[PDB]
């Protein structure tokens, strides 16, 4: 089986930028008829994927002159000479020279902007959930940049790696930042077995984690 490897999984760019996205095949991808069936697709948010390039270098009719494909052997490249706002989305490479046909993981074309430390907010269980016998400790790390971030929970001083559900938003269309939610889900009794609940955020901006917490009995 021929596997396609894409890099990077996220390419932050400034509009006007000339960019190059790469794709690596586990081995040579030349069909027995001599053609290389390497295709490039762009999927715009909310839409289905669209063809850009076929057979390595052929630009699909109707596709802007700023897109172009190249490569040989196991190395392939998609080029965009001058990035526009419309080009933002995820690009996928694909090989159909050998079966099974294989897709690359995709590379997200995202926008660059100034670094942004996240605003961290921690929320103790609501009395209604408690009343229903549940206890969810939510934490929001909002509007940060770059998207890379680590969240750590500490219950009564000790780290809690188990039972954490995290979700991330796509880059904001207005401020180009990113946000994430982390929810520690416990039981009413489990939650009442401790007093301190802490949410720590490690962003390339703070190093020493942004720390937020509360005590089940005081504030």
């Amino acid at each position: 089986d021929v596997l396609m490897t894409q890099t990077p999984l996220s390419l932050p760019v400034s509009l006007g930028d000339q960019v190059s996205i790469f794709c690596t095949s586990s081995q040579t991808i030349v069909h027995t008829n001599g053609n290389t069936y390497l295709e490039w697709y762009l999927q715009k948010p909310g839409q289905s994927p669209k063809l850009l390039i076929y057979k390595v270098s052929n630009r699909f009719s109707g596709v802007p002159d700023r897109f172009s494909g190249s490569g040989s052997g196991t190395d392939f490249t998609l080029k965009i000479s001058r990035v526009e706002t419309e080009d933002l989305g995820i690009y996928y490479c694909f090989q159909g020279s050998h079966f099974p046909l294989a897709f690359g993981a995709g590379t997200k074309l995202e926008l660059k902007r100034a670094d942004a430390a996240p605003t961290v907010s921690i929320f103790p269980p609501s009395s209604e959930q408690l009343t229903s016998g549940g206890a969810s400790v939510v934490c929001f790390l909002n509007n940060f940049y770059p998207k890379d971030i680590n969240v750590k929970w500490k219950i009564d001083g000790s780290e809690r790696q188990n039972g954490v559900l995290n979700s991330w938003t796509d880059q904001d269309s207005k401020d180009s930042t990113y946000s994430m939610s982390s929810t520690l889900t416990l039981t009413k009794d489990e939650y009442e077995r401790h007093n301190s609940y802490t949410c720590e955020a490690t962003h390339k901006t703070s190093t020493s984690p942004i720390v937020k917490s509360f005590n089940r009995n005081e504030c």
Binding site: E39, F99, L165, S181, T183
Partner: protein
């Protein structure tokens, strides 16, 4: 005008069966190769199967045996019989028209969503997320809303019926355990709340659910 419209997608219990359909237009199946490609929740693209202008059929070993592609050349309808369905088979399915020995997936349909799950329609638990006394000592304040354990997706969450639009972040739903859980956060000035009313409005069409939760300051 080439057109591809997928139908049949829907909820299906594991091991269950489902037939997807794709009505084509603007071309003939005798002149083009057709395929099915799916996009998983993770946004990963996967080739499901294809049938050439001449009838030849191809499948990856993962789909081989479980899925069956066929076509009605006369009515110009492509089909995908799905069986032995697992949660990993949960994805958006697209039929695609390609050019023989030229381009595999030249034109994609918008797709039909297939969701494999044992879960049953469950209304969501909507909880108001008020700040801890420590976070409320600034010029702005972040409030939240927890929409827990619902099925299926989606739910519709707004703030003040949509009145409250900016400074909001409604996070993608995740599976808590065959059930979905989502949360939204809204950030406003300290003078906006609790000084002014802020309610989380969550609807869940599948269960005819429409609940409202007002975020009240904590404390006795």
């Amino acid at each position: 005008e080439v057109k591809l419209v997928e139908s049949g997608g829907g909820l299906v219990k594991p091991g269950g069966s489902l037939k997807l359909s794709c009505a084509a237009s603007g071309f003939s199946f005798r002149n083009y190769g057709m395929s099915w490609v799916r996009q998983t929740p993770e946004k990963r693209l996967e080739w499901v199967a294809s049938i050439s202008y001449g009838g030849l059929i191809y499948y990856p070993d993962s789909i081989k045996g479980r899925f069956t592609i066929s076509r009605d050349i006369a009515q110009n309808i492509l089909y995908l019989q799905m069986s032995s369905l697992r949660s990993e088979d949960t994805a958006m399915y697209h039929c695609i028209r390609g050019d023989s020995f030229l381009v595999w997936f030249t034109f994609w349909g918008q797709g039909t969503l297939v969701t494999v799950s044992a879960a049953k329609t469950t209304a969501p638990s909507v909880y108001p997320l008020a700040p801890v006394c420590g976070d409320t000592t600034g010029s702005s304040v972040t409030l939240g809303c927890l929409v827990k354990g619902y099925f299926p997706e989606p739910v519709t969450l707004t703030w003040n019926s949509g009145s409250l639009s900016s400074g909001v972040h409604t996070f993608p739903a995740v599976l808590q355990s065959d059930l979905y859980t989502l949360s939204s956060s809204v950030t406003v000035t300290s003078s906006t709340w609790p000084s002014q009313s802020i309610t989380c409005n969550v609807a869940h069409p599948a269960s005819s659910t429409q609940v409202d939760k007002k975020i009240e300051p904590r404390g006795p």
